[PDB]
Amino acid sequence: ELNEFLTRELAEDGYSGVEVRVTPTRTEIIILATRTQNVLGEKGRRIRELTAVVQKRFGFPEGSVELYAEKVATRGLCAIAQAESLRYKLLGGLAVRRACYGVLRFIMESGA
Amino acid sequence: YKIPDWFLNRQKDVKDGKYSQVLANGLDNKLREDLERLKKIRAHRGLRHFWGLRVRGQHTKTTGRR
Amino acid sequence: KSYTTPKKNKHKRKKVKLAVLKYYKVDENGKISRLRRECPSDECGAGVFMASHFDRHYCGKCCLTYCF
Amino acid sequence: GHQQLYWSHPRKFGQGSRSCRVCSNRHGLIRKYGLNMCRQCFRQYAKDIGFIKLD
Amino acid sequence: HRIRITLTSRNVKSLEKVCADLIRGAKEKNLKVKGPVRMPTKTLRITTRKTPCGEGSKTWDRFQMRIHKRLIDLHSPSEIVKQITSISIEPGVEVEVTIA
Amino acid sequence: MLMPKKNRIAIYELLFKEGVMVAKKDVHMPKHPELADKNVPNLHVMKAMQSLKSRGYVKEQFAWRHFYWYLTNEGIQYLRDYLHLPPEIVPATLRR
Amino acid sequence: FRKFTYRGVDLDQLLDMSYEQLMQLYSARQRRRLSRGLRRKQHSLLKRLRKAKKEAPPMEKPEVVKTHLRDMIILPEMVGSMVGVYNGKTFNQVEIKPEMIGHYLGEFSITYKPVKHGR
RNA sequence: AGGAGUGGAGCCUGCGGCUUAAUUUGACUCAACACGGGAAACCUCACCCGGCCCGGACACGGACAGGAUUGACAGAUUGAUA
RNA sequence: AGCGUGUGCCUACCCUACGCCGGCAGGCGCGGGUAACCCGUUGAACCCCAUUCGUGAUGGGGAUCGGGGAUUGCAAUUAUUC
């Protein structure tokens, strides 16, 4: 549900999955999105909106959950990062042929 | 002769409030009455009996074919 | 599509202009001629007046009833 | 009163009482191990929960 | 002093190298330990139809989810255990520590 | 949705206390799990929030069965005007 | 010639009897039904029918008092009354002569239409 | 080559037809017919017969605090203490 | 014997030993188990051995149908199930 909620939220911001630690006193959940600047927003604003919202749904103790939003190294080899890249090329109004080659040419360059 | 009430076929009867094992011609005459009661009071159970149908919650769509 | 039996008339509110003017009767001097009984309840004290019904008395807030 | 009526009918048992935590559907409910997730819904989220197909 | 670690995982190799690293910690500080007692695996099993409707030949997914469970019994002081249990744990693993 | 101003203000204050508020999509759940003290029903929450969504004061998100609302800047100004608070203090999302 | 009974009791002896004692006479389902309790729920429409039956007017068969309640036991208290048992279509009039005690109200109004067969 | 059979019989069950206020429906050779995880008393429920509710966001206009509007026990009436 | 399941977020509803009462379904006091810990060494059936029956629609077969009795549930009648 975390992974789904984050997909519906950080779709345009280059979401590539979450990784959760259940470390003692600190449920450390790491968003793994491409554009780090756009997920933390204005001076770590939106990322705090995500901390505030998660514990309210999952009932974690007040300030006993911390969200990090680090970067995917070689983002060409994540499928859901290329599928979300492609869907926003298509919804941009680009011809499907152009967009698909654009992805396919990018990930074969990236080293797939 | 000490055979208990739970062991009889006509337990807590409607006309007399009596426990008694009712035998051949009695059982036929008292079966007749039990259906002819339900026929007389127009109760769903007897109406099913009058029309010659299955009463105890069966599906008649497929089974009970003469 | 077309149904036979006619629809149910909806409730319209019988709005009464200056309903406080009926609740009280202002005196010549600085005092009162309060016609309506005040509800002797805990939920509502001296503020809420009771209803002047034609075969009983009824409170509109806490749903208290007194009969003749 | 309508406030008494509106939700009067009990919802303590039967598939009209419980629903999918994803789908919000009254059918194909997997109750086993406290999933409570629809048989289509769980077939989508089986991987993400940790339900590998092997045998 | 008879303090009981209950390791439980989904993934074997992750729990196998942890229970090994805790039994390292028992030997590095040289206190007696009952070995990694292997509790039986729990294969959770959901066998659902494949089709969202009923409009194909009657196929069935057979999902498993294995839950491996190990336990390590120590004769240790409490603080040495709360030190070792912190060191090098990974997300596949789930660690309890019962005092008595 | 006609609801008490007491409830409505206990909603808008709770949205302004954080910069965020949630609710499960269940009209019939008679007590909001967060705000239980002041007995606010769960549908009052959804309708009071979709009011702000329609005239664009709050950001919408929805996963499975749960609404997630994020307060936006013009919504912040509307709420400190509509609740009459100090313009000094902010919701607990501009705090670092 | 003879007067109607129930088990081994006369109607005024049925009518002069508490529910605590009325239990141990008729059948197991109804005994359970009475033991489960007298209704404090919306099913206090049982008790509301107990109030609407106790508007028996002067000498004739009483007026048709209608119900959706098919899940109601024909008590000896009811007997002689004129009840409208609902089907979906028809509030069927039923005068409840005293052999119908123990039976449900819905047991006397067919919710289905009897089938006949054509080609 | 054979084994158990099924097709016969009784019942459970799905489908057509018939019936019906309604008997909700999708699916019709293999690849529809104990299939929709569909063993439905209520809910489920889509069907049909009754009766409440707004859970009609929001922008614009008349109303309107000299009170827009809300809710409300009897009695009637209702199936209902809607 | 071997797969297994078992007290639930909301979710209300868990598996059950043990002692009395009941012919029985069941009811009652009373503990264990969130489980290789308790049900449970899971004393399962078919099978095995020993009586009765004897080619008879028979002690095969258990449909329909009458009366009664218990449980779950807000409610079982068009019979929930036993």
From Swiss-Prot, chain A:
Residue span(s) of domain KH type-2: 2-73
Phosphoserine: modified positions: 16, 85
Modified residues (Asymmetric dimethylarginine): 45-46, 48
Modified residue annotations for N6-acetyllysine: 43
Predominant location: cytoplasm
Location of Phosphothreonine modifications: 23, 51
Signal sequence range: none
One Gene Ontology cellular component: cytosolic small ribosomal subunit
PTM comment, free text: Methylation by PRMT1 is required for import into the nucleolus and for ribosome assembly. Sumoylation by SUMO1 enhances protein stability through increased resistance to proteolysis.
Keyword presence, Mitochondrion: yes
Keywords: Acetylation, Apoptosis, Cell cycle, Cell division, Cytoplasm, Cytoskeleton, DNA damage, DNA repair, DNA-binding, Isopeptide bond, Lyase, Membrane, Methylation, Mitochondrion, Mitochondrion inner membrane, Mitosis, Nucleus, Phosphoprotein, Ribonucleoprotein, Ribosomal protein, RNA-binding, Transcription, Transcription regulation, Translation regulation, Ubl conjugation
Subunit structure, as described in the record: Component of the 40S small ribosomal subunit. Identified in a IGF2BP1-dependent mRNP granule complex containing untranslated mRNAs. Interacts with HNRPD. Interacts with PRMT1; the interaction methylates RPS3. Interacts with SUMO1; the interaction sumoylates RPS3. Interacts with UBC9. Interacts with CDK1; the interaction phosphorylates RPS3. Interacts with PRKCD; the interaction phosphorylates RPS3. Interacts with PKB/AKT; the interaction phosphorylates RPS3.
Record location of the Glycyl lysine isopeptide (Lys-Gly) (interchain with G-Cter in ubiquitin) cross-link: 71
Domain of life from the UniProt record: Eukaryota
Subcellular location: Cytoplasm; Nucleus; Nucleus, Nucleolus; Mitochondrion inner membrane
Listed name of the protein: Small ribosomal subunit protein uS3
Gene designation: RPS3
Organism listed in the record: Oryctolagus cuniculus
UniProtKB/Swiss-Prot annotation, chain B:
Disulfide partners: none
Domain of life: Eukaryota
Chain positions of cross-link Glycyl lysine isopeptide (Lys-Gly) (interchain with G-Cter in SUMO2): 15, 18, 30
Compartments where located: Cytoplasm
Modification type N6-acetyllysine: residues: 18, 30
Residue intervals passing through the bilayer: none
General function of this protein: Component of the small ribosomal subunit. The ribosome is a large ribonucleoprotein complex responsible for the synthesis of proteins in the cell.
Protein family membership: Belongs to the universal ribosomal protein uS13 family.
Subunit architecture: Component of the small ribosomal subunit.
Protein name: Small ribosomal subunit protein uS13
Species name: Oryctolagus cuniculus
Taxonomic lineage from the root: Eukaryota, Metazoa, Chordata, Craniata, Vertebrata
UniProtKB/Swiss-Prot annotation, chain D:
Record keywords, A-Z: Acetylation, Cytoplasm, Endoplasmic reticulum, Metal-binding, Methylation, Phosphoprotein, Ribonucleoprotein, Ribosomal protein, Zinc
Gene Ontology CC terms, in alphabetical order: cytosolic ribosome; cytosolic small ribosomal subunit; rough endoplasmic reticulum
Molecular function GO terms recorded: structural constituent of ribosome; zinc ion binding
Cofactor: Zn(2+)
One Gene Ontology biological process: cytoplasmic translation
Keyword Electron transport set for record: no
Principal subcellular localisation of the protein: cytoplasm
Cofactor binding remark: Binds 1 zinc ion per subunit.
Record keyword Signal present: no
Modified residues (Phosphoserine): 8
Residue numbers of Omega-N-methylarginine PTMs: 11
Cellular localisation: Cytoplasm, Cytosol; Cytoplasm; Rough endoplasmic reticulum
PROSITE patterns documented for this protein: RIBOSOMAL_S14
PANTHER family attached to this UniProt entry: 40S RIBOSOMAL PROTEIN S29, SMALL RIBOSOMAL SUBUNIT PROTEIN US14
Record function comment: Component of the small ribosomal subunit. The ribosome is a large ribonucleoprotein complex responsible for the synthesis of proteins in the cell.
NCBIfam families reported in the protein's UniProt record: PRK05766.1
Name of the protein described by the UniProt record: Small ribosomal subunit protein uS14
UniProt organism field: Oryctolagus cuniculus (Rabbit)
UniProtKB/Swiss-Prot annotation, chain G:
Signal peptide annotation: none
Cross-link Glycyl lysine isopeptide (Lys-Gly) (interchain with G-Cter in SUMO2) placement: 97
GO molecular function: MDM2/MDM4 family protein binding; RNA binding; structural constituent of ribosome; ubiquitin ligase inhibitor activity
GO terms (BP aspect): positive regulation of signal transduction by p53 class mediator; ribosomal small subunit assembly; ribosomal small subunit export from nucleus; rRNA processing; translation
Superkingdom of this protein's organism: Eukaryota
One CC-aspect GO term: cytosolic small ribosomal subunit
Protein's job: Component of the small ribosomal subunit. The ribosome is a large ribonucleoprotein complex responsible for the synthesis of proteins in the cell.
Family, per entry: Belongs to the universal ribosomal protein uS19 family.
Quaternary data: Component of the small ribosomal subunit.
Descriptive protein name: Small ribosomal subunit protein uS19
Species of origin: Oryctolagus cuniculus (Rabbit)
Origin organism lineage: Eukaryota, Metazoa, Chordata, Craniata, Vertebrata
